[PDB]
Amino acid sequence: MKDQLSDEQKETILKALNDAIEKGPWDKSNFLRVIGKKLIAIRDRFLKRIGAASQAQLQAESHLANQIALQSGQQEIYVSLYSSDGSNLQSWEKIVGSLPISRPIYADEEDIKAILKTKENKQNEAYVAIYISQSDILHLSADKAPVDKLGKPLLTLKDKSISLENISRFVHVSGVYRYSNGRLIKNA
Amino acid sequence: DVTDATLGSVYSEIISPVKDCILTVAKAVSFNPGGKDNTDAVEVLTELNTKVERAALNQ
């Protein structure tokens, strides 16, 4: 009666489900066939839960990672990205690899998503959250700081650093993704 | 959105629907007792649940 499930328990349950689905009379009748689908949907639900374990954990941790970041001279930064083939969920991966510049960088996530909202294509636009060193930021006064197409300040970064290996999310219309590293991205 | 499976989600999203299902197949059985297919289905559902419940309570 502990709530957390071990891998072996999860495996035993999956097996029970496979076996029940594989051997039941679910193709013998209209009634039975419908029950067969219900089962497949039950097994499906369950695989969606366990499949999601790791992303859920990373989500529950991201608050912690944030509070640590503030008090160790780090911050999460947001980089706007553009592709010519924005529908190809694979042509994005090759662009993220060439980050280590001219793209717009925002301190507030609300601002970069606002800017994306204005874009026409909306399929050719994405962005990555990135953990930064916060000593890496060249702090311009508000009198000097570049601004976007809304009157919102952008961040500028000091030279030849910030090739940071800690992305932590990739936002797109398709959905929120994750750098595998691996050089591919996916999440659900 | 989605979190891991727990003992609670196992009971809520596998064991309970499957019990409801057993109830329903039992009705379809009371129309023609001895209909093999339906009776078989009750046996498979019932096995499924005892295996999953065993697994959930870590027996």
What does this structure look like?
The complex is a heterodimer of chains A (188) and B (59). The longest helix of chain A has 22 residues. Chain A has two domains: 74 residues, no CATH class; 114 residues, ADP-ribosylation fold, CATH 3.20.170. By secondary structure, chain A is an alpha+beta fold. The two termini of chain A are 29 Å apart. Chain A is elongated, with a radius of gyration of 22 Å. Chain A contains five helices and five strands. The longest helix of chain B has 24 residues. With 59 residues, chain B is mostly helical. Chain B has one domain: Methane Monooxygenase Hydroxylase, Chain G, domain 1, CATH 1.20.58.90. Chain B has two helices and no strands. In chain B, helix 1 packs antiparallel against helix 2. The radius of gyration of chain B is 14 Å and the shape is elongated. At the A-B interface, helix 1, helix 2 and helix 3 of A face helix 1 and helix 2 of B.
Looking at this protein, list some descriptive labels.
heterodimer; A: 188 residues; alpha+beta; ADP-ribosylation fold; 2 domains; 12% strand; B: 59 residues; mainly alpha; Methane Monooxygenase Hydroxylase, Chain G, domain 1; 2 helices; 76% helix; 0% strand
